[PDB]
Structure formats: C-alpha cells, structure tokens
Design a protein around this motif. Sequence first.
Motif, mmCIF file in Angstrom:
data_model
loop_
_atom_site.group_PDB
_atom_site.id
_atom_site.type_symbol
_atom_site.label_atom_id
_atom_site.label_comp_id
_atom_site.label_asym_id
_atom_site.label_seq_id
_atom_site.Cartn_x
_atom_site.Cartn_y
_atom_site.Cartn_z
ATOM 1 N N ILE B 176 0.827 -1.196 0.000
ATOM 2 C CA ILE B 176 0.000 0.000 0.000
ATOM 3 C C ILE B 176 0.860 1.243 0.000
ATOM 4 O O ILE B 176 1.630 1.485 0.930
ATOM 5 N N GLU B 177 0.680 2.044 -1.036
ATOM 6 C CA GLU B 177 1.536 3.208 -1.329
ATOM 7 C C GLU B 177 0.757 4.528 -1.322
ATOM 8 O O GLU B 177 -0.233 4.658 -2.034
ATOM 9 N N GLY B 178 1.198 5.513 -0.551
ATOM 10 C CA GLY B 178 0.559 6.832 -0.561
ATOM 11 C C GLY B 178 -0.685 6.858 0.307
ATOM 12 O O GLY B 178 -1.178 5.807 0.718
ATOM 13 N N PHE B 181 -5.421 5.734 0.492
ATOM 14 C CA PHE B 181 -5.392 4.544 -0.346
ATOM 15 C C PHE B 181 -6.680 3.794 -0.083
ATOM 16 O O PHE B 181 -6.937 3.368 1.055
ATOM 17 N N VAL B 189 -8.351 -1.291 -5.858
ATOM 18 C CA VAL B 189 -7.658 -0.242 -5.150
ATOM 19 C C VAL B 189 -7.666 1.088 -5.877
ATOM 20 O O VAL B 189 -7.690 1.148 -7.107
ATOM 21 N N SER B 190 -7.677 2.156 -5.091
ATOM 22 C CA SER B 190 -7.400 3.492 -5.607
ATOM 23 C C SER B 190 -6.265 4.125 -4.822
ATOM 24 O O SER B 190 -6.350 4.304 -3.613
ATOM 25 N N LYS B 191 -5.189 4.417 -5.528
ATOM 26 C CA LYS B 191 -4.035 5.097 -4.977
ATOM 27 C C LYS B 191 -4.268 6.610 -5.106
ATOM 28 O O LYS B 191 -3.885 7.228 -6.081
#
Lengths: 202, 204
Positions: B176-178, B181, B189-191
Amino acid sequence: AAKIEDIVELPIKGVRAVQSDGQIMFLSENGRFVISGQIYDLWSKKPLNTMSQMRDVAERIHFKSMGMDVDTLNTVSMGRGDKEVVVFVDPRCAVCHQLMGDAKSLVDDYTFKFIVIPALGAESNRLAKNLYCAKDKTHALDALMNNTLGSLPSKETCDPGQYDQTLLTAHFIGIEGVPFVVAPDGRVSKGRPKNLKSWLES
Amino acid sequence: RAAKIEDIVELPIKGVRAVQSDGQIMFLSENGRFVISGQIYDLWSKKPLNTMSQMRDVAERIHFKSMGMDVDTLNTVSMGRGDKEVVVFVDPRCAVCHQLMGDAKSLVDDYTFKFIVIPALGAESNRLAKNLYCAKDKTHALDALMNNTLGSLPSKETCDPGQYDQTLLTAHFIGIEGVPFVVAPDGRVSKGRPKNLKSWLESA
C-alpha cells in the motif's frame, strides 16, 4: 512470430533464487509469490540451471557472452595487456581519476577500457560529448585522465542529443554508480577497489 | 521434510510482467533480461494464479480476508452501518484524507468504512497515531480523527507502541503506497482519492 495476447505488470520488486530439496524456486522480495520452473538469461542466451549460475548473474557481467562490444561505446583504451578490464567513469569523477592513475602501473598485464558516461550530469555531458567528438583520440586518454576534455578539438559535424547512448546502455544493463569496474573474469566492483592490483587477479 | 534452504541468491530483477503467448503465461523481467517459464503461486492467498484475469487481479485488487489480514486488528476506526466494507488508509494530518472521510459520511447507509490510520507523513503524525492506538476509550476515536483532535484523546496508563508503527510497516510490506489509499468492497484499489467515491465504490 507468436503474438502476445496480454501482459500484466506484477507487484514484484525483487526475486531470489532459493535452493531447497533438489529444486530452485524464485521467491519475490516480500515473499508474496513463488515461481516454480526454469529461468533463462535471454541476453546470454542460456538457461540457468545451477546456483553457481544464479550467483554468476548476480556477481558478474560478461559483455562478450551477452553480445555487447564495449568498444562501440564512448570508450578510450589505456595499456596493451592481454587481459581486458572495463571501467565506467564520469569525466568529473575524482575517484575515477584516481583509479585511472592506479591503473597506469598495471598496463603490462591489462588493457583498460575506460567507458565514459555522463552519470553526474550538467558539465559531465558537455565533457563526454567533447570526448566523443574529439578529432585525434590519441590525446583523448590524457584529457579524460586530467579533466581537460573541454579543450579537445571536435569533428566538424558531431552533435549528439543530450541522452547519451553509453549512459542509456549502462543504465539498462544494470551498471550503477561510478566508477564501476568489471574484471577480466567478469567480477564487478561497485566503486573503486581497495587495492586494484590484487582485486584484478580474481 | 521439512528440508533446509541450502543456498539463496538475490537476482538482478526489479520487476516482473506476466506475458501470455501460445497458451502459456511466462514471467519476464523489467529489462527483458530474464524469462521464467513455469507456475506462479500467491503464497499469501494460497492459490495458483493460472489465467491472465488472475494476474490482473493481483495487479488491481487487494483482498484482505483472502490474505488472512484482519484490518480491524490494525490501528483502525470504523464509520457507518452498511453491509459493504470499504477500507481507507489515512494519515491523521493528510488534508485529502480528511476530505475523503468527510465525503464518506454521506455513504454510511450503504457502506461501513474502515479508516486505518498510518503515520505515513511521520513526525507529528506518529504521536497522533499513537494517541489513537493508546486511547483508552475508542468510542471517541472516530470523531477525534475526523476533527483532527487526536492529541487530546486520553491514553491508557502504560502504552507506548514505539517509534516504528505496526500499521505503517504492514501497509509498506503488503504494498500500500501513498495516502489516502482506498480498497473497494470488491478489492479494487485506488491510490489517491477517486474522482467520485460513490460511483467508484460500486462493483466493477
């Protein structure tokens, strides 16, 4: 020509060859995925079947086996020895300049191929271009070694783009940082060796 | 059995694509140097990935339950009453996160939101994340997080989970990035905040 029907980028940032129970598997960096099967080095055109071969691709770079002729890059040669050493250098890199100095005492056993890459940007590009375009390359070596490349007389018609091929090639094939030494037997040194002479013999 | 690992080598591979050709799926490295022919297994979800939809699924979706990750065990506060669970990783100082949690309030009949708090922005966020984790009375946690008042939540008498936040480490590990999230009920997923949360949340 088989068509590729579909391609997906997997969430994998790294791969380990892991040997256990008469098999070698390929495990991702966070351990989410394991691949069972066979790995093939498309550049050297061979399957890697043993852990020695896995160690070899992690530890060594074999330019000829991969079909890469370093003399086609932005290269100056020093020495006439029978064993070839490759060194990627930035023209402004002082440690590189020192390495090239230590190498002068080794020209009887080795021929050093200094591959000039503008890794450090700005003025390094201008310098690497001056090397690439110099009319008389017999003085290129001295200029590279003394950080005096700026004065080298250029060919009348020589104007490369800013994206230096030797840099692109180095980045691509996985050369990181300067200086980057590749010994005759393929061993890589990421940085200047502690003692160059000994490091070079194996 | 079980057998030992005799040898391990880190290979010069920074990324892998699944490539479909001639009835098989091959695994090609990011610079094309290596191809692996054979079978890939998702060890976290404990299954073989055999088709490209399945490859796309690990690229596009995160399925917490399937991977044995119970998000309620992380530094988590819940909002809403809906039969569908939405997961959102947020930093307590993240303005975009606050706006998202805000938009989420209008959707609580259809969804139950899990706000997983991570100090991704470090520093002051750590103390806030700690304060939530160590809050003795968790019934006021949601409001404090959403009103940016976590600093005043009364703490348990002996509670100091340390400098390295477990939720943050876990988010980092599983990729999980940023922040924010978002993970939809169907795993997508939406980053970043989706343009329109309501429509984006519906199955797709």
